[PDB]
Amino acid sequence: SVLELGKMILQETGKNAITSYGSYGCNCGWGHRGQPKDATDRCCFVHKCCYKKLTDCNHKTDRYSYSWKNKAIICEEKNPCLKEMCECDKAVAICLRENLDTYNKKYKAYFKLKCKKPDTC
């Protein structure tokens, strides 16, 4: 759920998931859709398309088990839908971390700004 996702984003990026990423660009922002503005927003579109596969569990509110051990996120969960939910979160948190060198605080409040139509997953 979002509590595991927010914690991995903190662990990997040092950032506050709600405020730094919850209205960024065209895909990271909660509820946002559209073509990606940068690599950071691209990680978010990839993350959506990974969630879209989860039919037997809810990515927002079902909680899963994972450890942050030796600076890495390990998904220790065994219910299968929950383990893929953990793999989808782990991957966005890693991708965010890698592309932090281009985040850009101006896409940062992007709820009202413009977005071409999104590609297909």
From Swiss-Prot:
One of its GO terms (cellular component) is extracellular region. Pfam families: Phospholip_A2_1 (PF00068). SMART domains: PA2c (SM00085). Monomer. Expressed by the venom gland. The keyword Transmembrane helix does not apply. Residues 105-117 are annotated as: Important for membrane-damaging activities in eukaryotes and bacteria. Keywords: Disulfide bond, Myotoxin, Secreted, Toxin. Snake venom phospholipase A2 (PLA2) that lacks enzymatic activity. Displays edema-inducing activities. Is myotoxic. A model of myotoxic mechanism has been proposed: an apo Lys49-PLA2 is activated by the entrance of a hydrophobic molecule (e.g. fatty acid) at the hydrophobic channel of the protein leading to a reorientation of a monomer. PROSITE patterns: PA2_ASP, PA2_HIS. This is Basic phospholipase A2 homolog AppP2. GO terms for biological process: arachidonate secretion; lipid catabolic process; negative regulation of T cell proliferation; phospholipid metabolic process. It comes from the Eukaryota. GO terms for molecular function: calcium ion binding; calcium-dependent phospholipase A2 activity; phospholipid binding; toxin activity. Belongs to the phospholipase A2 family. Group II subfamily. K49 sub-subfamily. SUPFAM superfamilies: Phospholipase A2, PLA2 (SSF48619). Its main location: secreted. It is found in: Secreted. Disulfide bonds join C26-C115, C28-C44, C43-C95, C49-C121, C50-C88, C57-C81, C75-C86.
